[PDB]
C-alpha cells in the first residue's frame, strides 16, 4: 500500500462521482446559502447593541424577530437540500464501488482464491465499504457544514475589523499543518484496523464453516482463545485511534484560542479602542467564541472521515489488481469436442515440482477417455487445465485445433460441463440448483428429465415440495449421494460438448451408480467425455483408459487390451 492524501483520493474518486455532478452542484449552492444565513444571523448583535434597545429607535426590534424566523426558514430549507443531495451522491458512489469490488472479485484467478481466505475478502466487501458509506455520508456532511461556517465567520471578522483577521491569518497555517499531520496518522491506524477486521472475520468464519469439527474434537477453547486475541487487537487499535484524536483536538483548540487571547490583548490597548464602538466588538469577540465550536466539530469528525478515506484508498488499490488473464478473442459457438494435450507440463503456483510432466493426450470427438491412477497422481489437475482454471507452463492444449488461450474464457467455459470432486451446491430450490445459471432457459420438463437421468427423481419425489424443496447451505439437508446426484443432474442438463466427471459416483452405491451409467451410455453416445474414476467398474466401456502415475501417463489402451499386456491396469483390476 502507499497512502496518498485527501485531495489525491478525491482526484481518484472523481471519475466515479462525475455522473452525479448535479447533486453536488445544488448541494454546494445550498451550502453557500446556509453559511450566509449562519453568518448573517450572528451579525445581528451589531445593530441590536449599537442601535440600542432603548438608546435608539426600536424600529430595529420592531422587525428583528421576523428576520430571525425567516432566516431560520431559509437555513432549514437549504440544510435539508444540501444534506439530502450530498447523501444521495455519496450513496450512489458507495453502491458503485461495492458493485465494482464484487465484479472484480468474481473475475480473479482461481490461484488467487487458493492463497486467500474468505474472511478477508468478505471483510473488504462488508467492513471497508461500510466505512466509506458512514464517512462519506455523516462525516462528510459535517465537515462541509462546519467548513462553510468557519469561512463565513472568517469573512465577517475580516469585514468588521481586519486588524484582527490578521491574527486569524497568522494562525490558520499552524492549524492546517497540525490537521494534516494528524490525518496521516489516522489513515495509517485505519488501514491497520481494516487488516485486523479481516482477521476477525476469518476467525468467525472458520468457526462457523467448521462447526461440526469444533464440536466433535472439542475445539471450543482454542477457537475462543483465537477470537479473544483478534478482538482484543481490534479494541487496542481503536484505542490508538482515540488517543490520536483526543490528543489532537485540545492542541488545535489551544492554538485557536491564542487568537482570542490576542484579540483581548489588542483591545486592551488604548490606541486601538475609540476607533470602534462596543457593538462592532460585540460581533468580533462573539465571532471568535463561535468560531472555536466548528473547529472542534471539524477535528472531531476528521477520524471518522479518514476511516473512509483509508477505505477508499484500499479499494482503489484492489480495483487495479490483475484479474484472470483473458487475451483470447475468438468465440466458439459449439466445439466439436476434440481436445488434445500436446506435451504439456504444469507446476502449481509456488510449488517447484511439476504436477504434470509430459502429457500427450488426445480426447477425440464423441469418444470417452477414462483417467485412472492412484490418489495424488494428477487427474483432477488435467481436468482443471481443460477448463483453464490454471494456465500451463509448456506445451499446448488445443480445442478444435486451436490453443485454449486463443478463445474467450466465457466462450471456452461454455463448452465444458464439470462434476467436480468436491461438490458445491447452493441455498436454492433443487430446481434452481439443477438449472443454476440458466433458470430462464430450461423448462421444468427439461429439469425433470435431467433429474431422471441422474437417478435423482425418486428421492426428489419424496421430499417436502419436490423440485421446489430448499436444500441447505451447501446441500446440507441432503445425504451425500443425493448431493452427488444433484450435481450430476446439474451437469447433464446442459448438453455441453465436453463432459468431465471427476469421480462423480464416489458417494453412490453400486445400483445407483449403474443406473446413472446406463443413462450416460445412451445420452452421451456422441459427446466427448472425460471420466476420472477410482472404481474400474465405472470405466470398463471407455474407448481409452489412461493410467496416470506421479503426473505422467504410464499406459494407455482399451479395457480388453490393458487386461492383457499385464501392466499397471491389470494389477489395479486384479486387486479389485
Amino acid at each position: 500500500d502507499k497512502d496518498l492524501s485527501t485531495w489525491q483520493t478525491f482526484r481518484r474518486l472523481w471519475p466515479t462521482i462525475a455522473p452525479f455532478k448535479a447533486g453536488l452542484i445544488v448541494a454546494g449552492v445550498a451550502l453557500i446559502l446556509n453559511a450566509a444565513s449562519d453568518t448573517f444571523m450572528l451579525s445581528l448583535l451589531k445593530p441590536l447593541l449599537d442601535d440600542g434597545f432603548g438608546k435608539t429607535d426600536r424600529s430595529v426590534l420592531v422587525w428583528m424577530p421576523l428576520v430571525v424566523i425567516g432566516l431560520m426558514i431559509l437555513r432549514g430549507i437549504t440544510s435539508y437540500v444540501s444534506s439530502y443531495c450530498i447523501s444521495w451522491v455519496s450513496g450512489k458512489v458507495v453502491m458503485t464501488m461495492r458493485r465494482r469490488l464484487f465484479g472484480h472479485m468474481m473475475g480473479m484467478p482461481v490461484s488467487f482464491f487458493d492463497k486467500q481466505s474468505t474472511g478477508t475478502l468478505l471483510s473488504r466487501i462488508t467492513y471497508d465499504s461500510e466505512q466509506v458509506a458512514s464517512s462519506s455520508s455523516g462525516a462528510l456532511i459535517t465537515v462541509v457544514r462546519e467548513g462553510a461556517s468557519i469561512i463565513g465567520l472568517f469573512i465577517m471578522m475580516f469585514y468588521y475589523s481586519w486588524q484582527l483577521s490578521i491574527i486569524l491569518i497568522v494562525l490558520a497555517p499552524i492549524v492546517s499543518i497540525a490537521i494534516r499531520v494528524v490525518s496521516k496518522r489516522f489513515r495509517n491506524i485505519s488501514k491497520n484496523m481494516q487488516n485486523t477486521m479481516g482477521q476477525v472475520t476469518t476467525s468467525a468464519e472458520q468457526m462457523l464453516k467448521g462447526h461440526k469439527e469444533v464440536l466433535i474434537f472439542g475445539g471450543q477453547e482454542v477457537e475462543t482463545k483465537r477470537f479473544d486475541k483478534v478482538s482484543n487487537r481490534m479494541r487496542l487499535q481503536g484505542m490508538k485511534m482515540v488517543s490520536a484524536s483526543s490528543i489532537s483536538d485540545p492542541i488545535i483548540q489551544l492554538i485557536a484560542s491564542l487568537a482570542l487571547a490576542f484579540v483581548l490583548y489588542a483591545a486592551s490597548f488604548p490606541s486601538v479602542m475609540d476607533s470602534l464602538t462596543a457593538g462592532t466588538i460585540t460581533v468580533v469577540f462573539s465571532s471568535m467564541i463561535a468560531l472555536m465550536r466548528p473547529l472542534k466539530s471539524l477535528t472531531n469528525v476528521n477520524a471518522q472521515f479518514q476511516r473512509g478515506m483509508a477505505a477508499c484508498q484500499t479499494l482503489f488499490t484492489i480495483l487495479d489488481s490483475e484479474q484472470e488473464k483473458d487475451e483470447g478473442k475468438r468465440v466458439i459457438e459449439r466445439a466439436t469436442g476434440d481436445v488434445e494435450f500436446r506435451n504439456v507440463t504444469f507446476t502449481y503456483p509456488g510449488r517447484d515440482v511439476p504436477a504434470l510432466r509430459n502429457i500427450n493426450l488426445k480426447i477425440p470427438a464423441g469418444k470417452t477417455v477414462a483417467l485412472v491412477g492412484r490418489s495424488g497422481s494428477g487427474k483432477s489437475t488435467i481436468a482443471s487445465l481443460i477448463t483453464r482454471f490454471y494456465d500451463i507452463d509448456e506445451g499446448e492444449i488445443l480445442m478444435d485445433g486451436h490453443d485454449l488461450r486463443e478463445y474467450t474464457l466465457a466462450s471456452l467455459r461454455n463448452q465444458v460441463a464439470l462434476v467436480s470432486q468436491n461438490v458445491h451446491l447452493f441455498n436454492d430450490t433443487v430446481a434452481n440448483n439443477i438449472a443454476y445459471a440458466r433458470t430462464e432457459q430450461y423448462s421444468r420438463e427439461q429439469i425433470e428429465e435431467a433429474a431422471r437421468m441422474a437417478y435423482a427423481m425418486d428421492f426428489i419425489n419424496k421430499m417436502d415440495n419436490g423440485l421446489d424443496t430448499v436444500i441447505g447451505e451447501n446441500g446440507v439437508l441432503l445425504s451425500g449421494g443425493q448431493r452427488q446426484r444433484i450435481a450430476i443432474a446439474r451437469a447433464l442438463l446442459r448438453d455441453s460438448p465436453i463432459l468431465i466427471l471427476d469421480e462423480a459416483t464416489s458417494a453412490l452405491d453400486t445400483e445407483s451408480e449403474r443406473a446413472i451409467q446406463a443413462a450416460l451410455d445412451e445420452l452421451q453416445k456422441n459427446r466427448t467425455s472425460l471420466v476420472i474414476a477410482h472404481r474400474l467398474s465405472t470405466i470398463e466401456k471407455a474407448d481409452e483408459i489412461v493410467v496416470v502415475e506421479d503426473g505422467v501417463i504410464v499406459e494407455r489402451g482399451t479395457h480388453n487390451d490393458l487386461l492383457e499386456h499385464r501392466g499397471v491396469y491389470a494389477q489395479l483390476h486384479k486387486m479389485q
Partner: nanobody
Amino acid sequence: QMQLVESGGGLVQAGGSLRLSCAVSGSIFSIITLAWYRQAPGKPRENVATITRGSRTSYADSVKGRFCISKDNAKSTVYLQMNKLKPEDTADYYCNAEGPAGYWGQGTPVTVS
C-alpha cells in the same frame, strides 16, 4: 516425441539364446510401462513380456519361464533375454511403450531353425 528402435538378432538355431534390445528415448523411462510384443506371420500381435516401474515383470503363459525382460535406467534401454527357443517362436518382435495404445517399434524379425 518418444521413439524407440530395436537392435535384435536374426536367424538362430532351436534351443539357442537371443537377447533383444530397444533403446527408448524422449520419455520418463523410470515410470512408463514397457512391453515386448511379437507377431507370427498369420497371428495378430501377442503380448510376450511386460515390465513396470518397480521392475515388476510379467510373462505370457505361452513363454513363461524361458524369457526374461529387464531394463537399464542409466542406458534407457529395455532387454528381452530369450532362452531355449522353439520354431513356434519365429515371429516379428516389437517393443512397446506405455500401453497397447502407446508407441511402437519398427520391428525385428527372429527366426528359429
